[PDB]
């Protein structure tokens, strides 16, 4: 009954773009911030009638935030550490949403602070989000926090850290990571499943979800199980190899290296849970109730992975 307007930031990011596409298709008007209008996705998103893009930085730009929230009733916020000041930006956005007065439900995409649950270090790009989560909880605005599982499409044969599905000379594939071969990890098809799940949270409403933490993951798989889904999907031998240090074969930003080293220690060295919150110990229950049509790792490897690889210029799929 009159779809409410949704405000979003980082519009071209996976989580935001997924929500935007489905929300607009069902009638929601969307107000989305993007750092720049250029780009395959930004251009794709601005061509959707129900969507309006507002280009500019979030860093020290509250005015843009006030503009974004004007006339909005719902918000889905996901920040990045890129411009630095992620905590600051997250608080400014929450304050801007409160000030707009019209936001009835504010969803923030949070991550754990591992050092709170054991003799473990805080993963640099995750812990900050939890801080923002604590802040948002204090605002007199209904809020819900989603914890995203590992994206299925992090996988690529390009020489990128942690999630390379390396193509060997013999046509076989190998995934090398510090993750214990058998401890199940939480996965997520961002493209297809983030959008529908977030929309159901909005449909259910703030009385049901105010204050809740939801694990946005629809299936748990150990690395060994992931490789077998790929092997089964591509009819190729795909095997997992546990490695102490992440193989970093290309140059990466300083902050990303620190993130990876934290990962070597937390999952490699300590074998700590991905979601170390007591609430998340099935961890997939709520997510599946929210969106029944979620896709698994085998469908990704077989139906999307080949196309994404060809799009990146790879030829193994001929
Ligand atoms: Cl609505
Ligand atoms: Cl438009
Ligand atoms: Cl509150
Ligand atoms: Cl490089």
UniProtKB/Swiss-Prot annotation:
Changing residue 200 to E: No changes in the Kd for NAD and NADP and 2-fold increase in the Kd for areA. NADP(+) binds at residues 10-15, 35, 78, 129, 151-154. NAD(+) binds at residues 14-15, 78-80, 129, 151-154. Induction: Up-regulated in nitrogen-sufficient conditions and down-regulated in nitrogen-limiting conditions. Its main location: nucleus. Disruption phenotype: Displays partial derepression of activities subject to nitrogen metabolic repression. GO terms for cellular component: cytoplasm; nucleus. Keywords: Cytoplasm, NAD, NADP, Nucleus, Oxidoreductase, Repressor, Transcription, Transcription regulation. One of its GO terms (biological process) is nitrogen catabolite repression of transcription from RNA polymerase II promoter. It holds the Pfam family NmrA. It is found in: Nucleus; Cytoplasm. Changing residue 193 to N: No changes in the Kd for NAD and NADP and almost complete loss of affinity for areA. InterPro entries: NAD(P)-bd_dom_sf, NmrA-like, NmrA-like_oxidored. Monomer. Interacts with areA. This is Nitrogen metabolite repression protein nmrA. It comes from Emericella nidulans (strain FGSC A4 / ATCC 38163 / CBS 112.46 / NRRL 194 / M139) (Aspergillus nidulans).
